[PDB]
Design a protein around this ligand. Structure first.
Ligand code: A27
Length: 285
């Protein structure tokens, strides 16, 4: 677009490249996403235009939608750091628990809002979690999933992996749970490098799901009665040194059955959020 100048490449998103851009009329700094051809579908235009009205302080603001000369451009608010880089810069000492807790609470607020409007993230990950100097964390890449680097499977819910074509809101809760454990331990919970490896890593840690813990699991599209039977591991061995309230909350976000899995609304009422404060991060720019 004529009104923008590329300053640098922010990264490579799911639907094309993302650039740091300066506006000419405003002088504002923005995140510009060049989307993906035939002539661009109408259905995708409406789904994207619905996202402009889906505003919350914990959702990266879609400033403008630009469709010009059979190419789509998504203009987003710019944030200085992503959670993947922040976790990398906090590897030596680890993100302090008060800050981990505030980030989780705000992300849950973000999720509770999307889920109230029947909007799923589908691909929550540190990469698409953005942070500012004020202590705010925001959800990015939202609603894009509905409308050749390797895609991370680490945060994928088991029902998606088991072939469920109709994801519920619970997939976002599973993804956020994995991020939470990772923020605590400074290591990915389930670093799978293939769908079966990803699934098998979940099975080794939380036990192989059977009809007992997940009614209707054996009838799922990709479920094989031939899967190995692993016994569950206690959460104290999974996430040390997260306290009992954190472990109990994480456990509820990581429930196999999406119906038994905690909502973003009920999670905000969990005793873990009794002593929630808003610390500011120490970020280097
Ligand atoms: C050093 C720059 C740190 C950074 O990534 N900043 C970003 N500011 N704003 C941003 C907005 C987005 C974004 C991309 C697609 C969407 O549909 C929504 C948002 C991204 C972003 C880029 C790649 C993958 C995921 C998110 C990064 C930033």
């Amino acid at each position: 677009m004529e009104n923008f100048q590329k300053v640098e490449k922010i990264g490579e998103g799911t639907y094309g490249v993302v650039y740091k851009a300066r506006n000419k009329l405003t002088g504002e700094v923005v995140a510009l996403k060049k989307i993906r051809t035939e002539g661009v579908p109408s259905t995708a235009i409406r789904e994207i235009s619905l996202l402009k009205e889906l505003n919350h302080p914990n959702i990266v603001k879609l400033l403008d939608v630009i469709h010009t000369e059979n190419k789509l451009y998504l203009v987003f608010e710019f944030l200085h750091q992503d959670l993947k880089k922040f976790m990398d810069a906090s590897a030596l000492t680890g993100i302090p628990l008060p800050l981990i807790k505030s980030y989780l609470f705000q992300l849950l607020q973000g999720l509770a809002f999307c889920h109230s409007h029947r909007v799923l993230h589908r691909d929550l990950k540190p990469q698409n979690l953005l942070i500012n100097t004020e202590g705010a964390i925001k959800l990015a890449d939202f609603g894009l999933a509905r409308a050749h680097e390797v895609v991370t499977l680490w945060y994928r819910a088991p029902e998606i992996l088991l072939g469920c074509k109709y994801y519920s809101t619970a997939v976002d809760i599973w993804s956020l749970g994995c991020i939470f454990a990772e923020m605590v331990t400074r290591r990915a919970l389930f670093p799978g490098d293939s769908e079966i490896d990803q699934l098998f890593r979940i099975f080794r840690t939380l036990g192989t799901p059977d009809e007992v813990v997940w009614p209707g699991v054996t009838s799922m599209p990709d479920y094989k009665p031939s899967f190995p039977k692993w016994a569950r591991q206690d959460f104290s061995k999974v996430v040390p040194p997260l306290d009992e309230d954190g472990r109990s909350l994480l456990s509820q976000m990581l429930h196999y059955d999406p119906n038994k899995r905690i909502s973003a609304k009920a999670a905000l009422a969990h005793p873990f959020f009794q002593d929630v404060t808003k610390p500011v991060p120490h970020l280097r720019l």
